[PDB]
Design a protein around this ligand. Structure first.
Ligand SMILES: CCN1C[C@H](Oc2ccc3c(c2)CN([C@H]2CCC(=O)NC2=O)C3=O)CC[C@@H]1C
Ligand SMILES: [Zn+2]
Ligand SMILES: [Zn+2]
Lengths: 794, 26, 344
C-alpha cells in the first residue's frame, strides 16, 4: 500500500505559554505552543494581536524565552521530543516575517536513561548557560556565553538519579540550580553550582534534609527575597539558606497544584492552578526593613475562582491571565478586584477552541446536503463536550461530563453517546455529584434494574456511567439511562438487527470491582428510543468485558475478553450465539469490512478472521505480532490495514505458499506526531482512493487516503524536492521528523506521503515553484493543478 | 542393590521387574 | 548486534532440555569431540547452543570451567547459564559430530510505560511515586490518570502494566511459599518473567510457549493465565489421572514449593511439595536414606493407571512434625490442565 496523510485540523490544545519580548523589545508577546505549532501574539490593551504562527518538524517539548548579553530583543529556545534544540530570533522586513534559527543541534545522548519526570529545560537567570535534564544521572550544559551556534554542550554527572523538578536560583553569586530528588530515605532539596570553568558541579549554598514527600514543584524566587518555593500536595515551603517558612493552606488540600506563573517581575505574587480548574494566588508578604534587606514575613494562599483545566498559566497584563488548556477550551480571564457574587474574582473573557482530547467521533450528514459533518466526544471532566465540525466551523455543546463513545441513530434523529460523571462518596452513604452535568440535567432519565450481579472514604471518587440520547438539532440531553453500580460501559452501536425493523441502541458493558483485576462478567443491552423514552429490549449477561461491538450483516459481532462471538437477533427479540472464535489475545479492537474481521490488542496484536457463510463459523486468515503499544486501528481495504502505535507512529500492514499467507507484512511507517484515538471512515467534502478521518489527543484531525503506485513515487520526488526549498524552523530535517521513532528504536518512514509538505508547494514563490518541478519535463503550472485537486479533500 | 532404581530409588525384589519399571521413566 | 541477529554457535551434541534463560546446567564432557569443542568455546565466546527439540533452543554461556583428569580420561567439567532464546535456521553436522547452527536470536521486546505518550506535561512532575492494598488502588488512579484522554479505561491499562502484573504473580506465589517477598524474585520484568517460568509447576510445552513469547509483558500475562487456568495437575503420560490441585501446593522448606533436589546418583528432581495427592499407588516400603526432607520417610509413588513415576509420599518419622503426610511430585511427570486458551 501507499498512503497520503494530510492534516484537516491543526492541534487545538495548548501545551505551554510564555510572556516576553520576542518580536520587539517594546511590546509584550505571548507565545503559545500547540504540539507542532508556535503562535506569536502581541498583548494589546484590548486583547491579543496575532503576529505569526509557525510549524516545526518536531514536538515542542521545551519552550523558553531568554535574552543573553548583547541582544536587541528576547530569543526563544525550543527543544523538541526527538531532542532537536534550537534558538530562534524574530525578524520582519516591513511585511516579510521570518523566524531565524540562530542555533540548532540535537542534544540526544546515545547512552542514557530517559528521565521519568521528563525533559526539563532551564536557563540561567543571567542567561549564562542552558541546563537540560534529558536523562537520569546527567545534566547537559549548553554554555550561553559567546555564540554557540552548534549548541555544544557538556554533560555534568549528577549523583542523585531521581530528580523531580529543577530550576536555576536567583540572586545567585555563581550559577546555582535548586533541585528536588527522591531517595530511598525520601524526597529532599539540594543545590549545586555549575562551574563552567571546571565543567563540573560544586557544592551549593543550602540543602533541605527531608521536605514533603509529594513535593513536585520548584519555583525560584527572584532576587528581592531570593530562594525557592517547594509546592507539594499538602504544603508549600520556601527555602533560602538560613530562612525557611512553610504553610499548609486548607484550600489547597482539595486538589494538586500543577502549573505556576510569576505575576509581578518582583516575585511577590505567583499564580497557582490545580487539576480541577481552580486558580490560586500565592502572595509573599514582604518586610520593609531599615537596612534595606527584606524578610519573608508570611506566605498567603488565596482562591481566585475557576477556569479551564489549565495546562499552563501566564499573567499577560491589566488583569488578563491566559489559561492554556489540554482537556478543555483555552481562555483569557480577567481577574477582577472585588469578590464577585460567588467569590470568583475570575471572570471569563475570551475562549479559544480545543477539540482535544478526541476520544470518539462519527461522521453524519445532518443537513442532508451530501457533505458530512463530524461530531466528536471531546474533552474530559468539566470540559466534556460534543464538537460538531462542518466545512471548518465548530459548534460546541458543553457537557460538564466526560463523553466516551458516540454513535448516530438516523431513524430517531438523535445521537447515542456514552458519558461518565464523577461523584464523591458523602455522608448519606450515597454519592453526591459536584457539578450539574448532562446526565443530571436531562429531561427523561432511566436507571437499570437487573439484579443480575448482587454487588469507603468520605472523599473517594466514584464514576457514574450513563447513556445519553441527544437530539440532532437542539442538542438537548433528552434521555439519560444510568447504568448499574460498579458497571462500566465500553461499547455502543446503533444498528437494525435481524429481520426486526426497529433500529436499536446496543451497549456492551463490563462489571468492574476494585479487587477483580480481570473482568469476569458484563452484559450486552439492547435499547430503543422511539417515544421520548429509552426502552430496554432485553439484555444478555456475558462472562467478561464487551470491549467492542459492530453490526455484522444484520448480526451483532461482540468481543468478550479473548472471544469474538457472533450473535443473531431472534424472532422473539433475543440475541443468540451462532459461532464462537476464541483467541490468544484480548479482543480489544473489532473492525469489519463485509465478511473480514479484524482483531487487535494493545500490543499491536493484529489478527484477521473471516466468517465462512455456509459453514457458520470463523476461520483465521492471518496474524502478525510485533509487540508495541497500539491505540487505534482501521481497515483501509480487504488487504491493507492501518493503525497508530506508541510514540505518535502510524503503520500499515498487508496480506499477500501458506506459511507466508498467514502473516501480515509491514508496508508503511510514519511519525505522525499525534496520538490517534479513533479512526473513522468518511469525508467532510463532496483521483486518490479511500477516506479515513482520525482525531487525536491534541484535537488534531487528520485524513488518510490510499494512492496508486505511480502517484506515490511522483509525490516522493516532490517531497525531497520540496525539502530543499522549504526551510525548517529549527533547522530540522523533514526526514528525521517523520522517521518512525520509538524510545526503543527509530527507523525511516515508508508508504506515507506528508500531504502537508506536498500542499505547501501552493504557498511557495513562483520562482522556487520552478526550482522543484525542474527535470521531473514537467512545468510549474502542471503541478499546481495536481496539488489543487489534493486540497479538494479536506 | 541390583534391584534399586537409579532414578526414583525404588527397590524391587527381582531384577526382571526393575526392568519393567525402567520403561516407566520414558 | 545481538537481538534479532543471525549467528552461528556450536551445539552440545548430547543435549535436549528446554533451557529457560537464567537457568544453569551442569555438564560433564568425556568424548574428545565435545572436549575439543568446550576448549575452543572457552577460548572464544564460551556460548554454545542448547537445542530444544525441533527448531528452537536457548544459548547457554559457560561461567565455570574445570578440567579434572580422573579415571584416566580427560574429563572436562563445565557449567553454563541460559542467555538468549533462538530459532534455528540451518544445522550443519561436522566431521567430528559436533553440530553447528545458523541461529536467529528471538526477541525480548522492551516496552515503555503504557502512559508514556499520553502523560500530560504538567502531570509529568507528579509521577515519581513516594517510596497494603489501598496503595494499589492509588497506584492505579495516579499512573493511569491520563487514560481519560484515551479511549480505554484505567483498569485495562493495568492488565498490561508490568509492575502490576509482577505483583499479581508474586501474591499468588506467596500462597505457596509464605517467605521472602522481595530480593527472592527479580525487579526487571524481563528477568521476573523467565524466573517465574522456571519455578512454575508447568510441563515442557508450556515452558516452550512462554519461551516463544516475545515481550516480557505478554509473557507475564500468560504466566498469570497458567496460574489461573491450569490449576489441576495431571499424569503427563496417560493424561487421565488428576494428581493434585493448585490449592494443595505449599513449601515445606524455605527454598520454594517446587525446588530442585538431587538423588544419590545425580538425577535432579524439581519436586513440587503438595499437601494432598490423589490416584497414586505407593511402590515399596518407606525409607529415609538420602531423604531430601529430613524427618520424613519417602515411599515411591506412581500412577494408578499407567504406572508412570510421579514422585514420593513423604511420611513423618516423629510425632512432633507437622505436616505428617505430604507428597513430593517431580515436575517431569505432571501436566497442567484446565478443569479455553492461554492468552497474552
Ligand atoms: C539400597 C541400595 N541403593 C541405595 C541408593 O539407591 C537410590 C537411588 C535413587 C534414589 C535413592 C536411593 C533415594 N532417592 C530419593 C528419594 C526421595 C528423597 O527424599 N531423596 C532421594 O534422594 C532416589 O531418588 C543408592 C544406591 C544403592 C545401591
Ligand atoms: Zn525409578
Ligand atoms: Zn498415568
Amino acid at each position: 500500500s501507499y498512503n497520503y496523510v494530510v492534516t484537516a485540523q491543526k492541534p487545538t490544545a495548548v501545551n505551554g505559554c510564555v510572556t516576553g519580548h520576542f518580536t520587539s523589545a517594546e511590546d509584550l508577546n505571548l507565545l503559545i505552543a500547540k504540539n507542532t505549532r508556535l503562535e506569536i501574539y502581541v498583548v494589546t490593551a484590548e486583547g491579543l494581536r496575532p503576529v505569526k504562527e509557525v510549524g516545526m518538524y518536531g514536538k515542542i517539548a521545551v519552550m523558553e524565552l531568554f535574552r543573553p548579553k548583547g541582544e536587541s530583543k528576547d530569543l526563544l529556545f525550543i527543544l523538541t521530543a526527538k531532542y532537536n534544540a534550537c534558538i530562534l530570533e524574530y525578524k520582519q522586513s516591513g511585511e516579510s516575517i521570518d523566524i531565524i534559527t540562530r542555533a540548532h543541534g540535537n542534544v540526544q545522548d546515545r547512552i542514557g536513561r530517559p528521565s521519568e519526570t521528563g525533559i526539563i529545560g532551564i536557563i540561567d537567570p543571567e542567561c549564562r548557560m542552558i541546563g537540560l535534564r534529558l536523562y537520569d544521572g546527567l545534566f547537559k550544559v549548553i554554555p550561553l556565553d559567546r555564540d554557540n551556534k552548534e549548541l555544544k554542550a557538556f554533560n555534568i554527572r549528577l549523583e542523585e538519579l531521581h530528580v523531580i523538578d529543577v530550576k536555576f536560583l536567583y540572586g545567585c553569586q555563581a550559577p546555582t540550580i535548586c533541585f528536588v530528588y527522591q531517595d530511598p530515605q525520601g524526597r529532599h532539596v539540594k543545590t549545586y553550582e555549575v562551574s563552567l570553568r571546571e565543567k563540573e558541579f560544586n557544592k551549593g549554598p543550602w540543602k533541605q534534609e527531608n521536605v514533603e514527600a509529594e513535593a513536585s514543584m520548584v519555583i525560584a524566587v527572584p532576587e528581592p527575597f531570593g530562594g525557592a518555593i517547594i509546592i507539594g500536595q499538602e504544603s508549600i515551603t520556601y527555602h533560602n539558606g538560613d530562612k525557611y517558612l512553610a504553610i499548609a493552606p486548607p484550600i489547597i488540600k482539595q486538589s494538586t497544584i500543577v502549573c505556576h506563573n510569576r505575576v509581578d517581575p518582583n516575585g511577590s505574587r505567583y499564580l497557582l492552578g490545580d487539576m480541577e480548574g481552580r486558580l490560586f494566588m500565592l502572595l509573599l508578604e514582604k518586610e520593609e526593613q531599615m537596612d534595606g534587606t527584606v524578610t519573608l514575613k508570611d506566605l498567603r494562599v488565596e482562591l481566585l475562582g475557576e477556569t479551564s483545566i489549565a495546562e499552563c498559566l501566564t499573567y499577560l497584563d491589566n488583569g488578563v491571565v491566559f489559561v492554556g488548556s489540554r482537556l478543555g477550551d483555552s481562555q483569557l480571564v480577567k481577574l477582577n478586584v472585588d469578590s464577585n457574587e460567588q467569590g470568583s474574582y475570575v471572570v471569563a473573557m475570551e475562549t479559544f477552541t480545543n477539540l482535544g482530547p478526541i476520544v470518539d467521533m462519527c461522521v453524519v450528514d445532518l443537513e442532508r446536503q451530501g457533505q458530512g459533518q463530524l461530531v466528536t466526544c471531546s474533552g474530559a471532566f468539566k470540559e466534556g463536550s460534543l464538537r460538531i465540525i462542518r466545512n471548518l466551523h465548530i459548534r460546541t455543546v458543553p457537557l460538564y461530563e466526560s463523553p466516551r463513545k458516540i454513535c448516530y441513530q438516523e431513524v430517531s434523529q438523535c445521537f447515542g453517546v456514552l458519558s461518565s460523571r464523577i461523584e464523591v462518596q458523602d455522608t448519606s452513604g450515597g454519592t453526591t455529584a459536584l457539578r450539574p452535568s448532562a446526565s443530571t440535567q436531562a429531561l427523561s432519565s432511566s436507571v437499570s434494574s437487573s439484579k443480575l450481579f448482587s454487588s469507603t472514604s468520605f472523599g473517594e471518587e466514584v464514576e457514574v456511567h450513563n447513556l445519553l440520547i441527544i437530539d440532532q438539532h437542539t442538542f438537548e440531553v433528552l434521555h439519560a439511562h444510568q447504568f448499574l453500580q460498579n458497571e462500566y460501559a465500553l461499547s455502543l452501536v446503533s444498528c437494525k438487527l435481524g429481520k426486526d425493523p426497529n433500529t436499536y441502541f446496543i451497549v456492551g458493558t463490563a462489571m468492574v470491582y476494585p479487587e477483580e483485576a480481570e473482568p469476569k462478567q458484563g452484559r450486552i443491552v439492547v435499547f430503543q428510543y422511539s417515544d421520548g423514552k429509552l426502552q430496554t429490549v432485553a439484555e444478555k449477561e456475558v462472562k467478561g468485558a464487551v470491549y467492542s461491538m459492530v453490526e455484522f450483516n444484520g448480526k451483532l459481532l461482540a468481543s468478550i475478553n479473548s472471544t469474538v462471538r457472533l450473535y443473531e437477533w431472534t424472532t422473539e427479540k433475543e440475541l443468540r450465539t451462532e459461532c464462537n472464535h476464541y483467541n490468544n489475545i484480548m479482543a480489544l479492537y473489532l473492525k469489519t469490512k463485509g465478511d473480514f474481521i479484524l482483531v487487535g490488542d494493545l500490543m499491536r496484536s493484529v489478527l484477521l478472521l473471516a466468517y465462512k457463510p455456509m459453514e457458520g463459523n470463523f476461520e483465521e486468515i492471518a496474524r502478525d505480532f510485533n509487540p508495541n503499544w497500539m491505540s487505534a486501528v482501521e481497515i483501509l481495504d480487504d488487504d491493507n490495514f492501518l493503525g497508530a502505535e506508541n510514540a505518535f507512529n502510524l503503520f500499515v500492514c498487508q496480506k499477500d505458499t501458506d506459511e507466508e499467507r498467514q502473516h501480515l507484512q509491514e508496508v508503511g511507517l510514519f511519525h505522525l506526531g499525534e496520538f490517534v484515538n479513533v479512526f473513522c471512515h468518511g469525508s467532510l467534502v463532496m483521483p486518490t482512493q479511500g477516506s479515513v478521518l482520525f482525531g487525536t489527543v491534541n484535537g488534531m484531525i487528520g485524513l488518510v487516503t490510499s494512492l496508486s503506485e505511480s502517484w506515490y513515487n511522483l509525490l516522493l520526488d516532490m517531497q525531497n524536492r520540496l525539502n530543499k526549498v522549504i526551510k525548517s524552523v529549527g533547522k530540522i530535517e523533514h526526514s528525521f521528523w517523520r522517521s518512525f521513532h520509538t524510545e526503543r528504536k527509530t527507523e525511516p518512514a515508508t508508504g506515507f506521503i506528508d500531504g502537508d509538505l506536498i500542499e505547501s508547494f501552493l504557498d511557495i514563490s513562483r520562482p522556487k515553484m520552478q526550482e522543484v518541478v525542474a527535470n521531473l519535463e514537467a512545468t510549474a503550472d502542471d503541478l499546481i493543478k495536481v496539488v489543487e485537486e489534493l486540497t479538494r479533500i479536506h | 542393590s541390583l534391584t534399586t532404581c537409579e532414578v526414583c530409588g525404588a527397590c524391587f525384589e527381582t531384577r526382571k521387574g526393575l526392568s519393567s519399571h525402567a520403561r516407566s521413566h520414558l | 548486534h545481538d537481538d534479532d541477529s543471525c549467528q552461528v554457535i556450536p551445539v552440545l551434541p548430547q543435549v535436549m532440555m528446554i533451557l529457560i534463560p537464567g537457568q544453569t546446567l551442569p555438564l560433564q564432557l568425556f568424548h574428545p569431540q565435545e572436549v575439543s569443542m568446550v576448549r575452543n568455546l572457552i577460548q572464544k565466546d564460551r556460548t554454545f547452543a542448547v537445542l530444544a527439540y525441533a527448531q528452537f533452543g536457548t544459548t547457554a554461556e559457560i561461567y565455570a570451567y574445570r578440567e579434572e583428569q580422573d579415571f584416566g580420561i580427560e574429563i572436562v567439567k563445565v557449567k553454563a547459564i541460559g542467555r538468549q532464546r533462538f530459532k534455528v535456521l540451518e544445522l550443519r553436522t561436522q566431521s567430528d559430530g559436533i553440530q553447528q547452527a545458523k541461529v536467529q536470536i528471538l526477541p525480548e521486546c522492551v516496552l515503555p510505560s503504557t502512559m508514556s505518550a499520553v502523560q500530560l506535561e504538567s502531570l509529568n512532575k507528579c509521577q515519581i511515586f513516594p517510596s497494603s492494598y489501598k496503595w494499589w488502588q492509588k497506584y492505579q488512579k495516579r499512573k493511569f490518570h491520563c487514560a481519560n484522554l484515551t479511549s480505554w479505561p484505567r483498569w485495562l491499562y493495568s492488565l498490561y502494566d508490568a509492575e502490576t502484573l509482577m505483583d499479581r504473580i508474586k501474591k499468588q506465589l506467596r500462597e505457596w511459599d509464605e517467605n521472602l517477598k522481595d530480593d527472592s524474585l527479580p525487579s526487571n520484568p524481563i528477568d521476573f518473567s523467565y524466573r517465574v517460568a522456571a519455578c512454575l509447576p508447568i510441563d515442557d510445552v508450556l515452558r516452550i510457549q512462554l519461551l516463544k513469547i516475545g515481550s516480557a509483558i505478554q509473557r507475564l500475562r500468560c504466566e498469570l493465565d497458567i496460574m489461573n487456568k491450569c490449576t489441576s495437575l495431571c499424569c503427563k503420560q496417560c493424561q487421565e489421572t488428576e494428581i493434585t490441585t493448585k490449592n494443595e501446593i505449599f513449601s515445606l522448606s524455605l527454598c520454594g514449593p517446587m525446588a530442585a533436589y538431587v538423588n544419590p546418583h545425580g538425577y535432579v528432581h524439581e519436586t513440587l511439595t503438595v499437601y494432598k495427592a490423589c490416584n497414586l499407588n505407593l511402590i515399596g516400603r518407606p525409607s529415609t536414606e538420602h531423604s531430601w526432607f529430613p524427618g520424613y520417610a519417602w515411599t515411591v509413588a506412581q500412577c494408578k493407571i499407567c504406572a508412570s513415576h510421579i514422585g514420593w509420599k513423604f511420611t513423618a518419622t516423629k510425632k512432633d512434625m507437622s505436616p505428617q503426610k505430604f507428597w513430593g511430585l517431580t515436575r517431569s511427570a505432571l501436566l497442567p490442565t484446565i478443569p479455553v486458551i492461554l492468552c497474552l
